[PDB]
Write a protein that holds these residues in place. Structure first.
Motif, PDB file in Angstrom:
ATOM      1  N   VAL A 116       0.859  -1.174   0.000  1.00 17.42           N
ATOM      2  CA  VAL A 116       0.000   0.000   0.000  1.00 17.42           C
ATOM      3  C   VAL A 116       0.898   1.226   0.000  1.00 17.42           C
ATOM      4  N   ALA A 117       0.631   2.149  -0.918  1.00 13.78           N
ATOM      5  CA  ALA A 117       1.397   3.376  -1.040  1.00 13.78           C
ATOM      6  C   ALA A 117       0.460   4.572  -0.979  1.00 13.78           C
ATOM      7  N   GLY A 118       0.949   5.661  -0.394  1.00 11.25           N
ATOM      8  CA  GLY A 118       0.153   6.872  -0.309  1.00 11.25           C
ATOM      9  C   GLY A 118       0.982   8.040   0.177  1.00 11.25           C
ATOM     10  N   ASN A 119       0.376   9.224   0.100  1.00 12.69           N
ATOM     11  CA  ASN A 119       1.050  10.443   0.533  1.00 12.69           C
ATOM     12  C   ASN A 119       1.153  10.465   2.051  1.00 12.69           C
ATOM     13  N   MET A 120       2.227   9.884   2.587  1.00 13.90           N
ATOM     14  CA  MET A 120       2.423   9.735   4.027  1.00 13.90           C
ATOM     15  C   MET A 120       1.281   8.950   4.666  1.00 13.90           C
ATOM     16  N   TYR A 121       1.257   8.893   5.995  1.00 11.85           N
ATOM     17  CA  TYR A 121       0.387   7.958   6.688  1.00 11.85           C
ATOM     18  C   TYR A 121      -0.235   8.609   7.916  1.00 11.85           C
ATOM     19  N   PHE A 122      -1.176   7.880   8.513  1.00 11.33           N
ATOM     20  CA  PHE A 122      -1.756   8.218   9.802  1.00 11.33           C
ATOM     21  C   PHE A 122      -1.623   7.017  10.727  1.00 11.33           C
ATOM     22  N   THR A 123      -1.722   7.277  12.032  1.00 13.35           N
ATOM     23  CA  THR A 123      -1.474   6.234  13.025  1.00 13.35           C
ATOM     24  C   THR A 123      -2.436   5.061  12.857  1.00 13.35           C
ATOM     25  N   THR A 124      -3.745   5.337  12.827  1.00 17.77           N
ATOM     26  CA  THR A 124      -4.714   4.248  12.720  1.00 17.77           C
ATOM     27  C   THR A 124      -4.734   3.657  11.314  1.00 17.77           C
ATOM     28  N   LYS A 140      -1.486  -4.367   9.989  1.00 14.52           N
ATOM     29  CA  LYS A 140      -2.042  -5.490  10.740  1.00 14.52           C
ATOM     30  C   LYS A 140      -2.590  -6.562   9.806  1.00 14.52           C
ATOM     31  N   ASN A 141      -3.015  -6.173   8.603  1.00 17.41           N
ATOM     32  CA  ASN A 141      -3.608  -7.088   7.637  1.00 17.41           C
ATOM     33  C   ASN A 141      -2.604  -7.580   6.597  1.00 17.41           C
ATOM     34  N   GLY A 142      -1.309  -7.409   6.852  1.00 17.76           N
ATOM     35  CA  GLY A 142      -0.273  -7.992   6.025  1.00 17.76           C
ATOM     36  C   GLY A 142       0.301  -7.108   4.939  1.00 17.76           C
ATOM     37  N   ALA A 143      -0.014  -5.819   4.929  1.00 22.47           N
ATOM     38  CA  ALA A 143       0.503  -4.931   3.901  1.00 22.47           C
ATOM     39  C   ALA A 143       1.811  -4.287   4.350  1.00 22.47           C
ATOM     40  N   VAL A 144       2.530  -3.728   3.381  1.00 26.08           N
ATOM     41  CA  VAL A 144       3.757  -2.983   3.631  1.00 26.08           C
ATOM     42  C   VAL A 144       3.555  -1.580   3.079  1.00 26.08           C
ATOM     43  N   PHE A 145       3.658  -0.579   3.949  1.00 21.94           N
ATOM     44  CA  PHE A 145       3.427   0.799   3.547  1.00 21.94           C
ATOM     45  C   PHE A 145       4.673   1.384   2.896  1.00 21.94           C
ATOM     46  N   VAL A 146       4.458   2.232   1.893  1.00 21.92           N
ATOM     47  CA  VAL A 146       5.535   2.935   1.205  1.00 21.92           C
ATOM     48  C   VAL A 146       5.121   4.391   1.047  1.00 21.92           C
ATOM     49  N   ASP A 147       5.941   5.303   1.563  1.00 22.58           N
ATOM     50  CA  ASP A 147       5.669   6.729   1.445  1.00 22.58           C
ATOM     51  C   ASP A 147       6.099   7.200   0.062  1.00 22.58           C
ATOM     52  N   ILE A 148       5.150   7.715  -0.715  1.00 28.23           N
ATOM     53  CA  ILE A 148       5.433   8.184  -2.062  1.00 28.23           C
ATOM     54  C   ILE A 148       5.111   9.669  -2.215  1.00 28.23           C
TER      55      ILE A 148
END
Ligand SMILES: [K+]
Ligand SMILES: [K+]
Ligand SMILES: [K+]
Ligand SMILES: [K+]
Lengths: 455, 448, 448, 455
Positions: free
Chosen positions: D116-124, D131-139
């Motif tokens: 999962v990629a997106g413009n930065m992130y939020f805590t929740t 928690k559901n198996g994804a890896v976040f990428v800041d783009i």
């Protein structure tokens, strides 16, 4: 035979539920006068149907949209539009309640020395007429004075009494006709549409104005739909509109059939009288754009007036009262007949036949009712009638009653059962009900603050 | 015999009152599934007692005092003190409703592979348990599975079944015991205090934790005061407090017996478990200081929970349900007995003893109920079971609290009694469409 | 220098925000009379501070607890205790608003042919006095009639004028003294405690009763705390209580300083007069237990009266008015001084020193005010006087309590300042239509 | 330059107004942690803009019309109709708040092992993805990581970073793109419409789904109308609708830009995913007809969403924040730039340059702010960043800030002046601000319950 409530309970009001011995203590400290009881100490309060109604969710939504501006409030325009649509009158002036509108009407349509005639009277209505120089004349049909006579439309005006009054006194000395719907003094008895059109027919020939005391006009409208032939297919709103087509104006207490806790207004069609109406309202009630009412109250009243037109609401309202009267009569309990639209009247004279009227049977019955059930009722006998301070002795009315007045949408049939079962149980031991002696009596309006003790 | 409402009507809710031909039109467009009816087209809505209660004037006053702060809200402090006072638990975590508390409890007290046992189950409760690797085991007394058996405290746990479970599986593989009060699946049946005290005696000997599903605990308390010897002089609050003294925690759905339209919470006494509870609540519900609830709702729930302790309120609530059951039973209408605290269950098997279970007797009865009277009920038979054939094929008439009168019950009963006299006309329905899971909500039908 | 609101916004009211061309269209259809404008077409409504206040969350909670009983309402008991505690009077009779209390007082304390004297008058107050056979006599200090004179406690009564009135007419022909706090006609001007104590000294020597027109008594109390030596350490409640200790009774309009939208009451200490008060209230207002007010309104007024005693509320209320006046005065805009507690009065004589008084300068200024900014103001000049030529030709910007912000005042001031810079463009209006009485409400106009 | 409130105050909320010495006592008993203060002890609470908004009179009217039915509520249909009209999505599922919708979305659109990629992130948001198996990428574009860089649309996604991610990892392993509007981590920075259409252009070519985190989409819409050329004539509702035309769905927190105190929902256009969405909502939130919300809350949210579209409301909202940032910057107070749509971030590192980060300058600044003014702010520095329990030492973020988060329609400009004047006065004596030492530190989420004492 009796319909269930055509609504759900949205919110409830907490009550004490104190035991019989506590209620006796509360009644003792209240001087055995139901008027002195605290609201918090009462399970079912049948003191009045005035301003005690339960509003709907739509009305409370309107309460959140109070446009509280001194002039040009949207709530006034909504109220104005509703009254002109449902009642058909050209002009409307809001008042804080009905007696405020009656004060305005009496000062606008009465010249000193003139006469006012109508189907019996009310306490505040007769005062404003008499205070402004008028002389009241009761022109109701004689049947309205028979408590036990079970006939329909007991509040109709006798056309002969009206015709004779015009001849003996002259039309120019007749201020107006005050036709009340319903008639509170006869027990909440209705007036037929045929009687209304006849009154308009006779007055219009002599240029005599007619004004309605429409505080319970919706209850009156239901009786027309139920008991007058030719109106079975017409809706409540249609009947209400036709009633007022035979009137030049009206005084309304919204605290009754407008399903609100405060409010009233004054209607009329004459432009010049309306111009004068706006001049007097500023010194007694307020600006013609709010008339002693908050904007949210005008909104609730405008919404409630539209809700009162629902046939199912008014049918349930009347039949809930009828259910109480029928249960009492089916057990032998003596009541005034027929059961009116808003209250059941217990005949305390027959209920307490072992007591004389000087022992205040209605007052002692009301105190016994509360102690046994937690139900507040109103004494409507010798105590309320007061004295004639010139002679000093009591006034003695033909009716010595206890009034069980049902607020709108506040109680259920099970509450009526609580009322009836306690009174029926009281009747089976009615010989135990004891008379009361005055311990404290005020100079005036003794019903509100007088106290008693058993004899 | 039946007490009047111990309250006055403060405000009313407008209803449609549409005629029979329109109601039939409304039922046809709903596919003969009561779940698909619109609220506005329903006179008396007996679909559930969850979140449909009427609040008091005191609660609505509290609604105007919503302290909406993210942390340190006065409304949270009110709720916390009230629960700590009436229930006696040390810690409380608010949740948006009961299943929110169940998600927290299941993830905190269940190791994968362990067992959870309790007096029957609920859909969301059993899901979160199975979601976290548990296996559910029903340890209710066998009598709870007979609809017609009229006995007291039908929701008690069988101690023999619990004792055997400990021996056959071992205490270490037992996560906790999920004791529900009342037992919704058995018909709203109560649990006696003696059974609660006995269950705690047996679990404590093996270090087995006990957690209550306390959503209808107040209805349960009234049955103890009414039918269990030794509690006639004890108050509702005293009984409720004694009930929870035999549990390590509870999950509460305030939408049931807290007299509110939204809300729940999770209680417990263990400090370390409460510490972990606050870590999980932020990612699912919200801050532990509000937990997915507005401040005004926390206030309403604190007030409503205290109002529920009034004996006259809870007596009237139960006896209004009993009044409906007694009127139906006196006319010969088959119901599950004894009448529970929150609902009357029509026995669709006996009511439709001519249609097979594959003809959806409960679902066809419920659709027939609405057209004749304007009353919505819930199918509680094969369709809700999703596991094709349950022992109970019932229709649930669930009474919201403080919403309806005896005259409303009369409309329900008198319409059902007239319907029962023509029960041969109630026919099966066409199945049409079923979703993969939870078929009861979106299935549609037609008459045969 | 100017304090922020000592409260948060709990809920907001939607407004139109219509453009200038629409506002001109709205003003044309209103006949250039601000009284004829619709509320919905107004951004900032400064027509009056009567009944336009914003209530608090505590008051709205009280509104949900309306005990609507005809007699013995808990809300009446709350109001009664609150007034008896804060004002110190023995008896209280609720009325639907202040003029309702004035009708009662005038009929109870006036013999036909007697005189009533006080610091200027009000329209409804003077009417009920004259309706009952009295003759009004203004005994305010002469300085109160000069708009530009900046002195403190401009509403004090001249003791010499009062002493001469007693000698020239006799005390027996003096019904009572009507002491208003504050003095609305002079611009919202306060009365010092020393003047109240001195007036009581002189009246008590001749058996002369004193009754207060206490509608803005709290604003008056703040000026005593701010500008009168000896009251810097005393609280608002202490000052209010001491004020009324020099009076035999009062008429109150709760719509002003009780922070409500409807309501008033009548206070007094005499038992026999209170007995007669209850006899008159039933035929004009209602039962002495509710007096033409809903229970919820009696509750709101009891709570609002107590909220008004908070120093920070009343300080902010006055200084928000002062802020508007100071911003206008610093730009050269002519106003009456000193700035009163509830309104800023634009001096239409100086603002329009080129139009005659027969060209309705105040009325034309008020119509011009609305089109440029969307602000409604009230004409307080010749038209309201109905007695054709008053000394004061002013436009009133009346500030409801807790309704507007400093940014709203800036809109008012910045629009008026821009208007003043083009004051030569403000032209007189055509008279058109006048009713027999109270011409200000329904007259209509057109530009020349 | 700064518009006045485009509304009147209908009702007010009582506050304490306790003196400075009392506030110090309250701060001491709170352990110098603003999170431990009681709401009743706070004049101006700038802790968050989540669920703290002031509703309108229209919304409270809607609150009186709560249709509380389990299924078929009229309030849901009104909410559904409003979202489909303003956002344009086919299906909507209500949730008790935004993170409830994020839990549903993460379980519906993520296969274990995907990215999962997106413009930065939020805590929740990041949790439910991880928690559901994804890896976040800041783009997000690199400029979003410069606090002092005053440029527009700092929250835009870097198209190169997205293009490179697709090539290096493959589209089939990309769950979706999480485009947030606005971007909370960069300080409430907006995303341009041009960036949104480009993201849709690139993802649609690879069958990659796009979901918006639209919690502050109205604030984002205003920035497009103010600062992106070609949108000056378009209304807020028109801009909002076009934004979502480049998305397959969204997760919304109504507690923010829907002007309510509770509520959220999940939108999408795919029918099959919506079928699965209704299955999961019953076990986490509730029936798809209410989704963990009372009917009255769905009504208030539906009304508030329509009110948020008024240009004057959103302009005032953003400019009230801008006014606070501008007043601080005009006095030399160091802030994060540009000022975001919902909050002003004080740079505590520069404010407390005499303190090291291990002395918790942001936490000590927030405590000093409350004692001097009665204003609650949030520490957004080393304390909130927490520890890495593997190593045990603190996490050390580039941003050590104090967040002044403005609830909607709750405070006035004079309240902003109170905030600014106290902080500006603090800055002139910033050398007096003392560091804090931990006295109590919890195992996890230390920001909420930790306590301190001066050094
Ligand atoms: K009332
Ligand atoms: K609900
Ligand atoms: K008003
Ligand atoms: K909130």
């Amino acid at each position: 035979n009796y319909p269930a409530e055509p609504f759900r309970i949205k919110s409830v009001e907490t009550v004490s539920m104190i035991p019989r011995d506590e209620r006796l203590k509360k009644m003792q400290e209240a001087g055995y006068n139901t008027f002195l009881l605290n609201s918090k100490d009462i399970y079912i309060d049948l003191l009045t149907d005035s301003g005690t109604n339960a509003m709907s969710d739509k009305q409370w939504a309107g309460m959140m949209m109070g446009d509280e501006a001194y002039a040009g409030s949207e709530n006034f325009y909504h109220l104005e539009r509703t009254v002109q649509e449902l009642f058909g009158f050209k002009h409307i002036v809001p008042t804080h309640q009905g007696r405020g509108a009656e004060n305005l009407l009496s000062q606008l349509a009465i010249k000193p020395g003139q006469y006012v005639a109508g189907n019996m009277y009310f306490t505040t209505t007769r005062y404003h007429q008499e205070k402004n120089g008028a002389v009241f004349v009761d022109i109701v049909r004689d049947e309205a004075h028979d408590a036990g006579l079970n006939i329909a439309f007991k509040g109709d005006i006798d056309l002969k009494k009206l015709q004779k009054l015009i001849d003996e006194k002259g039309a120019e000395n007749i201020a107006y006709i005050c036709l009340a719907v319903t008639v509170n003094l006869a027990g909440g008895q209705p007036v037929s549409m045929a009687n209304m059109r006849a009154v308009r027919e006779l007055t219009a020939a002599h240029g005599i104005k007619v004004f309605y005391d429409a505080t319970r006009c919706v209850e009156n409208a239901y009786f027309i739909k139920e008991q007058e032939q030719g109106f079975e297919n017409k809706s409540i709103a249609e009947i209400v509109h036709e009633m007022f087509s035979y009137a030049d104006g009206c005084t309304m207490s919204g605290k009754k059939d407008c399903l609100v806790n405060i409010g009233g207004f004054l209607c009329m069609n004459d432009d010049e009288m309306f111009s004068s109406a706006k001049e007097l309202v500023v010194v007694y009630e307020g600006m013609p754009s709010y008339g002693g009412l908050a904007g949210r109250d005008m909104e609730a009243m405008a919404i409630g007036l539209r809700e009162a037109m629902q046939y199912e609401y008014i049918e349930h309202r009347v039949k809930q009262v009828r259910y109480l009267g029928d249960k009492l009569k089916a057990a032998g309990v003596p009541i005034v007949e027929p059961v009116g639209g808003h209250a059941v009247f217990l005949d305390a004279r027959r209920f307490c036949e072992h007591l004389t009227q000087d022992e205040f049977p209605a007052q002692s019955l009301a105190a016994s009712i509360y102690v046994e059930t937690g139900v507040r009722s109103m004494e409507r006998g010798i105590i309320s009638a007061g004295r004639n301070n010139v002679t000093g002795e009591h006034h003695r009315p033909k009716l010595e009653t206890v009034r069980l007045t049902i607020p709108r949408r506040v109680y259920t049939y099970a509450h009526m059962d609580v009322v009836a079962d306690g009174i029926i149980k009281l009747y089976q031991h009615k010989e135990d009900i004891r008379g009361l002696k005055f311990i404290y009596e005020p100079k005036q309006l003794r019903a509100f603050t007088a106290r008693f003790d058993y004899i």
